[PDB]
Amino acid sequence: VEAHPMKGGDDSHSYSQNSCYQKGVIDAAKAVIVEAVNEKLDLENNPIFDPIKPFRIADFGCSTGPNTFHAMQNIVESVETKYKSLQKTPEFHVFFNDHVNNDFNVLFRSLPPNREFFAAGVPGSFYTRVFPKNSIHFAHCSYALHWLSKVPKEIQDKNSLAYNKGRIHYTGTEKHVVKAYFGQFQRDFEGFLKARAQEIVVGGLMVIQIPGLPSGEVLFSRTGAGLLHFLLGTSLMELVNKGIINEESVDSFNLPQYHPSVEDLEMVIEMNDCFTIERVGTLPHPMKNLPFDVQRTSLQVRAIMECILTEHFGENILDPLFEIYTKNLQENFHVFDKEIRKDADLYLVLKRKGNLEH
Amino acid sequence: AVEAHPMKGGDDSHSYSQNSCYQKGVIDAAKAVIVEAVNEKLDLENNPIFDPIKPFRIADFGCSTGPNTFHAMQNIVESVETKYKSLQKTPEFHVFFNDHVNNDFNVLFRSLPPNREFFAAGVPGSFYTRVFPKNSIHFAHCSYALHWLSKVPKEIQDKNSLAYNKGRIHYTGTEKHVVKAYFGQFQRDFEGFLKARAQEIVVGGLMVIQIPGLPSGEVLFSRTGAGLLHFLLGTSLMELVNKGIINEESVDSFNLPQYHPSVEDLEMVIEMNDCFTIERVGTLPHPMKNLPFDVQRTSLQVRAIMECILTEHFGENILDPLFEIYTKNLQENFHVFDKEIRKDADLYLVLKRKGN
Numbered sequence: 001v002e003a004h005p006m007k008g009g010d011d012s013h014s015y016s017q018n019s020c021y022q023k024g025v026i027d028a029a030k031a032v033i034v035e036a037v038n039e040k041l042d043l044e045n046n047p048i049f050d051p052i053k054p055f056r057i058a059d060f061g062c063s064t065g066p067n068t069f070h071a072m073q074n075i076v077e078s079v080e081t082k083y084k085s086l087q088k089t090p091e092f093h094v095f096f097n098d099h100v101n102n103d104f105n106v107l108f109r110s111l112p113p114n115r116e117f118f119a120a121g122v123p124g125s126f127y128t129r130v131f132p133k134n135s136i137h138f139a140h141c142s143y144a145l146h147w148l149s150k151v152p153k154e155i156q157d158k159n160s161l162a163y164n165k166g167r168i169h170y171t172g173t174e175k176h177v178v179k180a181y182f183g184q185f186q187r188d189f190e191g192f193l194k195a196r197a198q199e200i201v202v203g204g205l206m207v208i209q210i211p212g213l214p215s216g217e218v219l220f221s222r223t224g225a226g227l228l229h230f231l232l233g234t235s236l237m238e239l240v241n242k243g244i245i246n247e248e249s250v251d252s253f254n255l256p257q258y259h260p261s262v263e264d265l266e267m268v269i270e271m272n273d274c275f276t277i278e279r280v281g282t283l284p285h286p287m288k289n290l291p292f293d294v295q296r297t298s299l300q301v302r303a304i305m306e307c308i309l310t311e312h313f314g315e316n317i318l319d320p321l322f323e324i325y326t327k328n329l330q331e332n333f334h335v336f337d338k339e340i341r342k343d344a345d346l347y348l349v350l351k352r353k354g355n356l357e358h
Numbered sequence: 359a360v361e362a363h364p365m366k367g368g369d370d371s372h373s374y375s376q377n378s379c380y381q382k383g384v385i386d387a388a389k390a391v392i393v394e395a396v397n398e399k400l401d402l403e404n405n406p407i408f409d410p411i412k413p414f415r416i417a418d419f420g421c422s423t424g425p426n427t428f429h430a431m432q433n434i435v436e437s438v439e440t441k442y443k444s445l446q447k448t449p450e451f452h453v454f455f456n457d458h459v460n461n462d463f464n465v466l467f468r469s470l471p472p473n474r475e476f477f478a479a480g481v482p483g484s485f486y487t488r489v490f491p492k493n494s495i496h497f498a499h500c501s502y503a504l505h506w507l508s509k510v511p512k513e514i515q516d517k518n519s520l521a522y523n524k525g526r527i528h529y530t531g532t533e534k535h536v537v538k539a540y541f542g543q544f545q546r547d548f549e550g551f552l553k554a555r556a557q558e559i560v561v562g563g564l565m566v567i568q569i570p571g572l573p574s575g576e577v578l579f580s581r582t583g584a585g586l587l588h589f590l591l592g593t594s595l596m597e598l599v600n601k602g603i604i605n606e607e608s609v610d611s612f613n614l615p616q617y618h619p620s621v622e623d624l625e626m627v628i629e630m631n632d633c634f635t636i637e638r639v640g641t642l643p644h645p646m647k648n649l650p651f652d653v654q655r656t657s658l659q660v661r662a663i664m665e666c667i668l669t670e671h672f673g674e675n676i677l678d679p680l681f682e683i684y685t686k687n688l689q690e691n692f693h694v695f696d697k698e699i700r701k702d703a704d705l706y707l708v709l710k711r712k713g714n
């Protein structure tokens with residue numbers, strides 16, 4: 001399965017309380033949800049959405065909260081509002097999906113007590129089927145689909161054209177490595193869409209928010225995620241040159257992520273042919289005109305990468321890794337604060353096609 | 359509201375998952391009941407309510423952490439699947455695992471069988487409340503959970519009442535005021551459970567219940583294994599009082615929120631609720647009936663069940679001294695458990711949700 005969930009407690013080092021960026025994405029996304037419900041959720045006279053049956057909502061890659069709760073409440077409230085305009089009130093059933101090793105204990109223990117929906121947790125890779133056919137009316141996936149199901153094996157192979165020596169991700173400049181990652185993304189995202197097309201009802205909506213490439217931009221390294229990753233690699237190599245880890249440990253380490261362009265996403269979706277694209281765009285993120293926060297960014301990265309870094313390098317690498325990291329962020333403060341593209345959060349609104357619609 | 363006392367989490371040698379073999383035997387014995395219930399009472403053929411275009415939805419109420427809940431759910435899926443095949447249908451299955459919010463769903467999820475043929479979801483919440491949309495469950499299951507009350511009866515906590523449960527932590531059956539208080543709480547809780555389930559289960563849907571109870575013809579709960587295990591847990595606590603390790607008031611004020619009903623107790627609540635018919639009822643033949651009493655495993659079984667509620671009231675420093683004494687007392691009562699106790703205390707029900 002090759003699963004890497006986020007740091008799962010409720011304390012200072014947990015995802016719950018180092019996921020403020022991904023929350024701003026949700027906050028700006030509320031408008032996206034509301035507009036998609038009002039313009040594209042066809043409730044009226046439509047037995048697919050018969051309010052005598054429950055309205056079922058699923059979050060794919062929900063993590064441990066609070067972001068997933070804000071997102072789900074946004075959807076429940078927008079949908080409940082439209083039904084109200086039709087003098088109906090269905091029950092809501094909300095499903096929280098993540099990897100089997102996600103901390104569902106923490107999630108369940110922090111469910112809003114005030115909630116007006118029934119809740120369930122659904123353990124399993126969203127690159128597989130996790131629901132019966134035709135059961136989901138509204139699907140949501142925010143900041144999860146850039147995670148691949150695995151590192152492309154050819155970049156781990158010393159003898160491959162695509163061997164990713166001396167780096168932990170891609171920048172856009174090495175043709176063979178980028179091709180390997182993009183190839184893996186095509187397969188994973190197609191598997192996601194295939195599973196969702198079976199699970200989502202005809203006319204059902206799916207909203208996706210994903211770290212991507214800003215339009216026109218060809219170099220992932222000129223995004224914020226891209227430079228952060230590049231510096232993580234250079235920070236690891238400094239631990240190498242000090243002798244604290246060997247060079248093989250870094251050569252063999254790679255991030256299982258791809259950050260697609262809008263054109264990349266559109267290609268896979270159109271080929272899959274089960275969803276219509278109702279809208280694509282970018283999310284203006286709320287913290288955009290604040291100054292770059294060197295310290296807090298270094299913490300957000302650690303809370304994301306801790307497990308995968310530990311599992312490969314061991315616990316004892318973290319504290320000295322990220323003190324080097326923070327240092328490299330500071331030397332690059334200008335770039336992060338005034339040069340890098342702020343607009344790399346992409347969103348898509350999809351609608352599941354009818355069975356007689358090609 | 360909710361006073362939740364889940365079983366010991368994790369998957370190590372002290373966990374519920376490694377110390378719940380007796381509860382597994384109950385499910386193993388009930389497999390025959392499920393098969394017969396499906397074959398004779400689940401009206402699949404040409405019934406729009408069980409339209410295999412939709413999934414067949416199964417819920418386990420009080421599932422804990424595995425593996426017992428997986429065995430029960432596999433048994434239900436296999437029997438229902440078999441019957442559908444005889445009608446040349448092949449529905450998908452959606453299996454819901456319900457327990458308290460503080461249950462260890464992490465352990466449960468991480469130990470789900472890889473080769474299952476059902477979609478799975480965990481549902482956190484007290485089963486004395488609604489936890490599913492109305493009219494959505496086709497088959498409900500509940501094994502060794504419904505003897506857990508929503509709370510201790512207030513009467514037995516009241517120093518002014520003859521029901522005040524001084525120097526004891528449960529009932530043996532000789533104290534009529536205490537027994538009446540627990541039975542009262544049980545009618546209220548079990549009624550609330552049936553009410554919520556009637557809203558959730560489809561017309562003709564089944565509910566299968568296994569519960570520790572009062573054996574046929576028996577009046578004294580202390581004549582069951584559970585009853586004697588509780589009696590001796592009380593006396594072990596009073597030994598800690600005597601040794602100055604806990605004060606007497608802490609035992610006086612502590613009580614187990616449990617009631618172990620007779621069949622007649624169960625029938626009375628079900629008849630008054632009036633939403634289910636009793637299709638089958640009886641006592642299970644437990645597969646461990648003829649094995650020798652195991653002192654160490656039984657002590658560990660009880661700790662796995664009780665550690666949370668004991669810790670909340672007495673503090674964790676009490677646990678090891680308490681179960682050192684408990685183990686000694688189980689050993690002193692070896693022959694009673696081995697040969698004298700009634701072992702026919704596993705009751706079952708097959709209920710079917712009524713029309714109108």
Ligand SMILES: C[C@@H]1[C@H]2[C@H](O[C@@H]3O[C@H](CO)[C@@H](O)[C@H](O)[C@H]3O)OC=C(C(=O)O)[C@H]2C[C@@H]1O
Pocket residue numbers: 380381502503570571582583584585587588660663700701703704
């Ligand atoms: C000590 C009892 C335990 C019970 O013990 C069993 O109770 C049955 C019924 O009396 C006996 O036959 C058997 O010997 C004994 O192991 O096993 C399962 C319980 C639970 O799941 O909460 C608890 C309930 C009660 O706390």
Ligand SMILES: Nc1ncnc2c1ncn2[C@@H]1O[C@H](CSCC[C@H](N)C(=O)O)[C@@H](O)[C@H]1O
Pocket residue numbers: 004005006019022023026060061062063064067068097098099102124125126127141142143144147149
């Ligand atoms: N294949 C997969 N199946 C299920 N969850 C996955 C997954 N790949 C990544 N994830 C999950 O996606 C989450 C990304 S963190 C994002 C969490 C949340 N949606 C938010 O907006 O803040 C993690 O919890 C991770 O475990």
Ligand SMILES: Nc1ncnc2c1ncn2[C@@H]1O[C@H](CSCC[C@H](N)C(=O)O)[C@@H](O)[C@H]1O
Pocket residue numbers: 363364365378381382385419420421422423426427456457458461483484485486500501502503506508
């Ligand atoms: N009100 C309630 N709501 C949900 N679960 C409850 C409950 N009261 C007790 N339980 C759960 O019921 C379980 C009883 S132990 C039985 C576990 C499992 N059915 C088996 O056969 O082994 C515990 O996990 C306990 O937490």
